[PDB]
Amino acid sequence: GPVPSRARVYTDVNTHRPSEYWDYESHVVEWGNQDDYQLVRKLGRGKYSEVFEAINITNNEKVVVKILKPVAAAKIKREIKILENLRGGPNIITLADIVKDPVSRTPALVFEHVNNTDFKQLYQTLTDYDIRFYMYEILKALDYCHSMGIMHRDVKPHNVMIDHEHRKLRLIDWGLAEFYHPGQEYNVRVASRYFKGPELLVDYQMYDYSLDMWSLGCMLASMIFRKEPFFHGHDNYDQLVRIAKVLGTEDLYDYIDKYNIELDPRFNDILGRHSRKRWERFVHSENQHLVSPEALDFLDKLLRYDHQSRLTAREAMEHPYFYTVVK
Ligand SMILES: Nc1ncnc2c1ncn2[C@@H]1O[C@H](COP(=O)(O)OP(=O)(O)OP(=O)(O)O)[C@@H](O)[C@H]1O
Ligand SMILES: N#CCc1n[nH]c2cc(Cl)c(Br)cc12
Numbered sequence: 001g002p003v004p005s006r007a008r009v010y011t012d013v014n015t016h017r018p019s020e021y022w023d024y025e026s027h028v029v030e031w032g033n034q035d036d037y038q039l040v041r042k043l044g045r046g047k048y049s050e051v052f053e054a055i056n057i058t059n060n061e062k063v064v065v066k067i068l069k070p071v072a073a074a075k076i077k078r079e080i081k082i083l084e085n086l087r088g089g090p091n092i093i094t095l096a097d098i099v100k101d102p103v104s105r106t107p108a109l110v111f112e113h114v115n116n117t118d119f120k121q122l123y124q125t126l127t128d129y130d131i132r133f134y135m136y137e138i139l140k141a142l143d144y145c146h147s148m149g150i151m152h153r154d155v156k157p158h159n160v161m162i163d164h165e166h167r168k169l170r171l172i173d174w175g176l177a178e179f180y181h182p183g184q185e186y187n188v189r190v191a192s193r194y195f196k197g198p199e200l201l202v203d204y205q206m207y208d209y210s211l212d213m214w215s216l217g218c219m220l221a222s223m224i225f226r227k228e229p230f231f232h233g234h235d236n237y238d239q240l241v242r243i244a245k246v247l248g249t250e251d252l253y254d255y256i257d258k259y260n261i262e263l264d265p266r267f268n269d270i271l272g273r274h275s276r277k278r279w280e281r282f283v284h285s286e287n288q289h290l291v292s293p294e295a296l297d298f299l300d301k302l303l304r305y306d307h308q309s310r311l312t313a314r315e316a317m318e319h320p321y322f323y324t325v326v327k
Pocket of ligand 2: 156160219223
């Protein structure tokens with residue numbers, strides 16, 4: 001069967017913490033007062049929650065309330081425990097309260113409000129300096145949660161909020177995050193299509209923090225090359241084909257050979273044979289202002305099939321691409 005894998009960093013952080021840290025089902029939720037929050041307007045709804053802008057009437061501060069749908073309310077202790085474990089960490093969204101919604105009769109998570117800059121505006125306006133600055137800020141959040149024994153598993157632009165005026169970044173939506181335990185087989189149905197790592201796409205379950213580093217690479221490639229998304233799959237199968245057209249099929253087959261993976265036979269008729277393309281293939285007049293040799297080298301070290309080969313968040317922070325960023 002498949003060859004096992006473990007992370008190369010923060011491998012046993014969970015074994016060395018009291019069980020209460022990661023045994024989220026044993027956690028006793030401390031409930032706040034729902035009357036402290038007045039709903040103002042609905043911001044959105046997904047298959048898992050409804051999100052509202054609200055006011056905390058005890059301090060007249062804006063907050064965001066995420067009301068869990070009856071379906072997603074089951075794994076709520078995992079999201080709660082992760083948010084409480086990470087609270088106060090670098091660029092981690094703050095969970096302000098947990099209340100029982102009077103209408104849905106489900107848990108409602110109350111978060112720090114971010115006056116975030118529009119995501120399309122961020123995509124279209126961030127300069128070369130800004131991309132480096134904000135990539136360094138998201139790396140601080142990722143290294144912190146990985147060092148705390150947690151994988152986010154849903155890194156994408158909409159989950160990395162930026163309030164551009166205050167040069168403030170927050171990593172949000174921890175509903176898919178999980179505790180990393182060496183040897184654990186995880187569900188591959190995580191992350192959003194364009195940000196799924198090859199490990200998910202080839203159905204390799206023994207993945208780790210390094211999944212988040214692939215997703216971060218996908219964000220970086222889209223930003224510097226002005227291509228949204230960078231790997232534009234029609235579905236989860238075509239997603240792997242899109243990747244293979246850039247990274248090549250030989251390194252893909254070496255990856256599945258190494259891990260002794262049984263690749264879905266549906267790929268035999270669609271992967272084809274592709275060589276790796278040099279990153280300069282994607283440079284053009286409209287993105288050259290965002291591209292540098294250091295950006296290409298950094299990207300090259302994130303977007304690797306072999307999850308064990310990718311830079312860790314702490315190694316990424318050491319890269320020359322960040323030397324120009326004021327620290
Ligand atoms: N802490 C927060 N501060 C301010 N706005 C927030 C906060 N958390 C979430 N939001 C916003 O709430 C809105 C609704 O949330 P939701 O997750 O449904 O949307 P989304 O991010 O556009 O979804 P998707 O994951 O499909 O891209 C979004 O505009 C999101 O940016
Ligand atoms: N794509 C896109 C826009 C965008 N949304 N959120 C971001 C976070 C960072 Cl770190 C960077 Br760089 C860019 C974005």
